[PDB]
Design a protein around this ligand. Structure first.
Ligand SMILES: Cc1cc2nc3c(=O)[nH]c(=O)nc-3n(C[C@H](O)[C@H](O)[C@H](O)CO)c2cc1C
Ligand SMILES: Nc1ncnc2c1ncn2[C@@H]1O[C@H](COP(=O)(O)OP(=O)(O)O)[C@@H](O)[C@H]1O
Ligand SMILES: [Mg+2]
Length: 147
């Protein structure tokens, strides 16, 4: 319904152990950004395009989940960009276009299944983003203003 969804936010640290440990870093935004997501952007795994500051636009996946830790009933969002960065980018602005949905969140019985699933999401996202309908969003003025 509300795809593509465009948003921008400062990259901020998260809690627990960071998914850098898995070789799959996931960037967070301030809760203000997540809170302004339309209700119809259900939890689950999405894909799209991202850039950092005035950088180039790269493929990405986003996980939207429920936040256990805040009162009311808040969501969480984290983005893994399919690009090798040479340094962290905490405090920079991450620009995202969420363009498609992959699947609901799932319960996994092991880290082995979870990691395999995440890697599979990343591979499927790379393929879907080649479709001309999604490939063009890479060139949206949304991103062209950020350079
Ligand atoms: C693309 C992607 C898909 C994910 N899918 C799930 C999932 O289906 N179930 C889950 O419990 N966690 C999922 N996660 C959460 C992942 O376990 C999380 O990144 C770290 O555990 C904490 O940042 C996913 C993360 C990413 C980046
Ligand atoms: N490909 C990438 N995608 C997302 N973040 C990246 C990427 N490469 C480097 N990073 C850095 O990794 C950080 C996320 O690492 P992570 O271990 O998930 O910790 P946290 O969620 O606590 O910030 C981002 O804020 C960013 O600085
Ligand atoms: Mg993270």
């Amino acid at each position: 319904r509300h795809l593509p969804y465009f948003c921008r936010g400062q990259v901020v640290r998260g809690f627990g152990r960071g998914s850098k440990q898995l070789g799959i870093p996931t960037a967070n935004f301030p809760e203000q950004v997540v809170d302004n997501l339309p209700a119809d952007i259900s939890t689950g795994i999405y894909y799209g395009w991202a850039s950092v500051g005035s950088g180039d636009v790269h493929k990405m996946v986003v996980s939207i989940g429920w936040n256990p830790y805040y009162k009311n009933t808040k969501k969480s969002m984290e983005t893994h960009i399919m690009h090798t960065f040479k340094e962290d980018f905490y405090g920079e602005i991450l620009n995202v276009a969420i363009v498609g949905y992959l699947r609901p969140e799932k319960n996994f019985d092991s880290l082995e299944s979870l990691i395999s699933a995440i890697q599979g999401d990343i591979e499927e996202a790379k393929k879907r983003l080649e479709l001309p309908e999604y490939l063009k969003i890479k060139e949206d003025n949304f991103f062209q203003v950020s350079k």
